[model samples]
Structures are given as C-alpha cells and as structure tokens.
Target: DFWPTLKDAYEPLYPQQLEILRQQVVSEGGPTATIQSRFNYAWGLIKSTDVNDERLGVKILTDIYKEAESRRRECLYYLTIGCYKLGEYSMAKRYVDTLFEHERNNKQVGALKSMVEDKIQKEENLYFQ
Candidate 1:
C-alpha cells in the first residue's frame, strides 16, 4: 500500500476509454443516467487530463453525491481530486475535509490533503507577493 504522490494522483489512468464511457452516459440521459453508469463516466472524466472533462466529472459526481447515499463516500474522493485538477482548491479542501471526518487515517486522503494545502499555500503566496 504505497502512498501516491501528487503526480501519480493527478495523472489520467484510462485516457483511451473515456470516449466510450462518455457515450454510454450520454445515451442514457447524461447527468440523469443511472448511478452506476454516471459514476463510471464521471470516474473516467475525473481521471482525464482535460479540464473540461474534469469540470463535467465534478458536476456529475456532485449530482451523485446529492442523490445517492451509499456512493457519497466514493464521490467525495473523486470530487476532491477533480476539483484539485481543475484548480478549485477551496472545493477540493471541502471534499477532502469531509472525507477526513469519516476516515481520518486514510493515507490517500491524507496525501490529497497535503497536496491541496500545498497548492492553497502557493496560491496565497502568489497573492501576497
């Protein structure tokens, strides 16, 4: 169980499969698709390198977060990463912090928190400079 670095956490894993996953969701009503399909598609998008796909992933995941109970835990992690990839540090912090409330010792979440805080700090530093 090795902890992933920020680069490992951010890199897309299945860039090739996104198109078919995306098509499946769109064919099934996109955002209104079944939870499993939507989640799969959203997962792919969050795993994408494109900012647009990341934004769409965040939206899809947030929708699932609001509508589903069992899936919220999954959504929180991907949503945090998606927000982070999209440079939405505040949103990323909120998601990660929420996850921390449940699984305080989760090493992946811990690593993600460090990255979010590091980015937030760098952004703040830029503002003050």
Candidate 2:
C-alpha cells in the first residue's frame, strides 16, 4: 500500500525524467535502473524539504534497507537532527537512539551522534548555568 501510494504520488511528476534516466542506464548498461531510481527518488524527497516527509522518507529507506542499509541510518539521523533543530530534544533522542543502534560501527554516524548529543547537552547545561 505504501509503496504503491508513494509511487503513485511521485511518479507522475518525475516519470518522464525518470524514464529518460532509465533509458540511459539501459543504453549504457553500466549501472542498474534500480540504483538510478533510488538516487532519483532520494533527490526528489530531499527537494521536498518537508520535515514531515521524513516519515515517508524513512519508510521508503526502510523498504530498501537490503540495498543500502546506511541510507536508512542517514534518514534517521536527519530526522533527529531536524527534531533537535526544532528544540525537541526528547523526540530527537528517540530517533538518535534508533540511529545508534544500527550504526554504532559507522564512524561518521558515531561522530554525528556525538555532535547532536553535545549540542543538546550544551543547551541543557546552559539552562542550569
């Protein structure tokens, strides 16, 4: 339902462009259409700039977890980052925890997590100071 819904909503807008990409990939036959499609889809989602879209983005990333698990990690990281920017530490922490659970071994992810945590802690400490 979600998959079809996402496609139905997004496809009409970009299908022609995506189809061109699809044809190019087929003509070159280097990278797979799936990879191209993923990139294109991610770009479209990013362009939306809708923080609420994070939920949909997360769902899409989760659906493609097998292809690129780290994409999901990044989505979660961004979701938390957005929450933190909005001064929602508790909500941010929830997503941050989820991100850490899967990406503990990822140095970039660990660094980003630490940065977010530090920002939150600093703000909290300033409140007490």
Candidate 3:
C-alpha cells in the first residue's frame, strides 16, 4: 500500500482565512474540533514573536527535529520560545526541562530556567497569599 501525500494548507492561507482561523482560536465557543468526534485537534494561530523568515525557519527546523530528534537542539529551543509566546508556560517548562535533562550545561536552558520557574511560582501562588 502506498501512503497518500498531503499538502499543507497553512502556507497559502489568505488574511481573511487566517482571520477566520484566528477567530476560531480566540472565540472559545466558536467550534470544538467537531462536536462528538472521537479524535480531537485544535488549531493555534501562532502569534510568533519572530517575524517573516524566522517563522518559516521554525517550521523547517521543527521538521528537522522530527526527522532526527538527537540532531537539532535548536528545534527544542525554538519550540520553547513558541510556547512562551502562546502563553503556554507549562509547555515551555516541559521543553526546557527536556533540554536540561539532555544537556544540563546548555546556555539556553540556563536562560529559560528562570522564566519557567517564575511561571511555576506564579501558578503555585495563585490560590494563596
């Protein structure tokens, strides 16, 4: 059996379409990945901090990370940044923790450590004084 090739619809999306997608992401009650479906998915219109080429770079680098997990530390690094931009502090910390576990001496992890810790601290102290 041959696998069917798939084309990513993400690149050619026009502004209007992107706005629609963005609205879906922002409006909590807009849609629910299709109601009553066994499989679930969510689309995030990544408001990535980096502009232009860097956005493309993240996708390419992440693909490379998928191809060779051991080769691209930068993938995890970029992903960590993406998580922060999306307000996904826990996910950012998870990626940072992975980098620390893999290479405790990584300078990026050192930079990220305090950021993650602060988020965690905020989360922990939320219900208290």
Candidate 4:
C-alpha cells in the first residue's frame, strides 16, 4: 500500500515547553507581560492532546482575539481548530468562515473549512435520521 500516514495540522507541544509558556504568562507577571508568551501558551494548549487543554486554549485565545487586534488573524485559525477538535462544529465554522473571508487564499483556512463543512453535513445527516 502506498497510503500516506496522517499528518497533524498543528505542531505537538511537550510538557516542558507548556510549563515554560505558562510561567512566562502567569509566574513571570501576567498575560500583559507579553502577548507573545500568552498567545504561545494558548497555542500550545490548543495543540495539546487533552480535551481540557483544548478548552482552556479556546478560552484564552477567544479572550486574546477580542482584545488583541494584532493577534485576531492567528487566533481565528487556532480557535477554529480547537473547536473542531472539541466537536463544536458550529463554533468552528463561524471562526473558519470569518478567517476565510479575510484570507481567501490561505491554504490552511481552505482545508480546515472543508473539514468543518464535512462534519456539519454528517451531523445534519444524523439529525435527519
């Protein structure tokens, strides 16, 4: 078989790196210390395998998305991915759609939107049954 292995859309995060990102935000000062550190931590949380971490990441990024204008572009991507992983396809599609309008040429957004639409169709099919 010449099938390819599944590739992760987001990079995996290690425990040590997660802690360091947390420390940079919480222990060092606060989320205001540096938006980069805060965003990095949230990104790690979203990329984490644990469901709880994904929720936390979604929450943090949502907050950043609202308050940090510069980070909204990236936040939209991660938030969509996080919600998709959590099976919140409605929320995922909302973010994905918005990002798509802004960056219509973005390959990542294109792929993620297709995934979200497929899941939504499946859910709708199940609902009709």
In order, candidate lDDTs are: 0.81, 0.52, 0.49, 0.79
The clash tally of candidate 2 reads 0
Q: Give the per-residue lDDT of model 2 (tens digit) for 10-93.
A: 333344654564455466553344643554454344334454543444444444444655455555654554455445677777
In model 1, pairs of residues that clash are: none
lDDT of 1: 0.81
- Write down the lDDT that model 2 would get: 0.52
Best by lDDT: 1
Candidates by TM-score, descending order: 4, 1, 3, 2
RMSD after CA superposition, every candidate: 2.9, 10.5, 12.9, 5.1
lDDT tens per residue, model 1, 1-129 = 333355754667566688888788899987678888988888778777787887888888888889878877877877888888889999999999998898788888888888899999988998768
Off by over 4 Å in 4: 1-11
Return the lDDT, model 3, position 20: 64
Give per-residue CA lDDT, model 4, range 1-129, as digits (tens): 111111353556788989888888986577566667778888788778888988898898888788777767777877888888889999999998998998888676788889999999998898769
Compute the lDDT of residue 84 as modeled in candidate 4.
87
lDDT of 4: 0.79
lDDT of 4 at 23: 86
Off by over 4 Å in 2: 1-74
- TM-score per candidate, chains pooled: 0.82, 0.42, 0.49, 0.86
Clashing pairs in 2: none
Residue-level lDDT tens digits of model 3 in 1-129: 111111121224444654565454345453333221100111122332334423443344344456544544645655565555545788778877887787686554676767777777888997896
